[PDB]
Amino acid sequence: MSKITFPKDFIWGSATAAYQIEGAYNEDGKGESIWDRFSHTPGNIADGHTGDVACDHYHRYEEDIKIMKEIGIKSYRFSISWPRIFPEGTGKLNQKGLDFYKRLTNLLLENGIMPAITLYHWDLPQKLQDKGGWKNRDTTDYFTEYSEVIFKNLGDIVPIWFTHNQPGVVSLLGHFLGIHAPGIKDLRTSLEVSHNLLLSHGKAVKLFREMNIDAQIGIALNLSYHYPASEKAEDIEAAELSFSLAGRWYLDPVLKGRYPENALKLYKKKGIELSFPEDDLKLISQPIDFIAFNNYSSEFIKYDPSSESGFSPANSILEKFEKTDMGWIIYPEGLYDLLMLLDRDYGKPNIVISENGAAFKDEIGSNGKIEDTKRIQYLKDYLTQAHRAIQDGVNLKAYYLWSLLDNFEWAYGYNKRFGIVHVNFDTLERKIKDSGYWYKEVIKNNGFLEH
Numbered sequence: 001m002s003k004i005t006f007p008k009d010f011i012w013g014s015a016t017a018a019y020q021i022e023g024a025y026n027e028d029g030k031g032e033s034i035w036d037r038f039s040h041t042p043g044n045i046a047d048g049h050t051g052d053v054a055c056d057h058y059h060r061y062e063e064d065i066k067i068m069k070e071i072g073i074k075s076y077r078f079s080i081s082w083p084r085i086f087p088e089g090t091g092k093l094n095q096k097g098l099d100f101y102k103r104l105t106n107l108l109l110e111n112g113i114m115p116a117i118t119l120y121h122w123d124l125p126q127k128l129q130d131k132g133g134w135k136n137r138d139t140t141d142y143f144t145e146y147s148e149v150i151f152k153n154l155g156d157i158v159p160i161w162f163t164h165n166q167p168g169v170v171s172l173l174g175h176f177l178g179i180h181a182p183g184i185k186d187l188r189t190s191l192e193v194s195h196n197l198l199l200s201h202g203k204a205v206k207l208f209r210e211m212n213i214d215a216q217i218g219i220a221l222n223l224s225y226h227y228p229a230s231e232k233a234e235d236i237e238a239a240e241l242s243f244s245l246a247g248r249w250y251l252d253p254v255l256k257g258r259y260p261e262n263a264l265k266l267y268k269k270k271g272i273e274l275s276f277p278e279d280d281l282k283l284i285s286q287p288i289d290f291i292a293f294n295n296y297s298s299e300f301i302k303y304d305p306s307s308e309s310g311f312s313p314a315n316s317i318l319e320k321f322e323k324t325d326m327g328w329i330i331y332p333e334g335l336y337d338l339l340m341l342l343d344r345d346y347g348k349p350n351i352v353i354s355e356n357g358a359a360f361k362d363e364i365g366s367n368g369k370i371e372d373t374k375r376i377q378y379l380k381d382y383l384t385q386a387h388r389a390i391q392d393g394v395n396l397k398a399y400y401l402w403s404l405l406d407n408f409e410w411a412y413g414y415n416k417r418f419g420i421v422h423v424n425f426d427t428l429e430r431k432i433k434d435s436g437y438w439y440k441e442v443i444k445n446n447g448f449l450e451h
């Protein structure tokens with residue numbers, strides 16, 4: 001037996017996103033977002049599910065905060081719905097939308113919970129999409145004007161700020177694969193969108209500094225460790241390319257002020273040679289108080305000479321792993337290896353785990369309990385590896401469990417449950433899962449026992 005104890009001031013949190021939990025999609029003057037439009041189009045979401053009602057958090061936030069206080073989370077990461085603030089993306093401010101998040105933040109503080117705000121978690125106002133969306137560079141200024149309203153109203157009571165959540169998913173799934181809003185399918189557009197997402201991050205950070213906000217700001221990137229299939233140089237180079245086309249396409253601009261050259265080479269080979277102003281990468285790499293990342297699984301990559309990419313997943317390795325209800329492999333060591341790479345490659349930054357969690361099939365037993373043993377095991381195993389990285393010198397400051405509530409899992413709808421709290425989407429009843437009660441004790445004890 002060994003006792004696992006995290007650092008004295010370690011921040012234990014849980015995370016949600018506005019569109020995934022709030023509902024009230026057309027109430028109090030809120031403007032239509034691209035995810036309203038995407039969800040209302042048949043064939044885009046599993047089972048025709050929508051985020052129209054979701055968890056109805058807009059009306060039940062007081063119950064959800066009381067649940068947060070029972071579990072004892074020290075920080076709550078949520079996102080603000082831009083179209084609740086500016087229904088047209090710019091123009092007239094909707095005070096009613098503002099007052100919602102002002103109230104929500106105030107009750108969180110009154111309940112001893114530290115708020116942590118994501119400014120952009122994919123709900124772009126549809127009016128801005130009608131003018132090109134993130135393909136239009138003007139949208140990066142509209143985002144900064146919206147951030148200024150939030151910074152002015154909440155900046156000096158919210159200690160932790162995330163500009164963007166997973167720009168790489170917005171780019172890849174929303175603008176190349178087209179399976180996320182706004183449903184666009186064009187490689188060049190998705191790369192222009194990637195740049196403008198990053199540029200809006202840099203503009204918001206610059207504004208954050210110029211407003212002298214007494215808080216910390218960062219960005220939340222989707223990151224995984226990409227393992228080479230072997231120690232042969234061809235597989236290492238293949239995994240390096242895979243990473244630079246995924247999370248490192250955003251990591252390197254943010255922390256080093258340059259796109260990865262090996263990924264640029266590939267896009268040039270495909271016929272796409274990118275050209276952005278010199279100062280754009282300066283702006284993108286504004287110093288940030290921490291780097292934050294969402295991690296769930298790991299990749300395993302092999303050299304694939306006859307393919308266009310030059311690499312492919314090492315399926316013979318991947319089939320040895322257990323999988324979650326999402327079909328993702330479970331490999332806890334991948335979180336240690338990822339944390340150690342962040343610490344090694346980027347000058348030992350302060351690091352925040354803005355999301356970690358797992359989806360499993362949930363069952364409400366005859367006792368009313370949800371005995372989600374596999375979810376507990378996932379979290380405990382991944383947290384053990386995060387603790388290991390801390391012992392080896394990584395400046396990991398916070399851990400946000402995805403998610404507080406079962407919610408709208410984008411194109412999967414309500415078919416995938418990530419919560420430590422079960423939500424019945426027909427009755428809106430909340431039931432804390434056994435994983436929620438486990439986390440409650442982890443927080444109280446600042447860790448757990450390993451047998």
Ligand SMILES: OC[C@H]1O[C@@H](O)[C@H](O)[C@@H](O)[C@@H]1O
Pocket residue numbers: 017020165166222294355402408409418
């Ligand atoms: O797949 C589960 C989660 O993926 C995350 O990386 C996204 O930020 C969440 O919005 C989503 O619910």
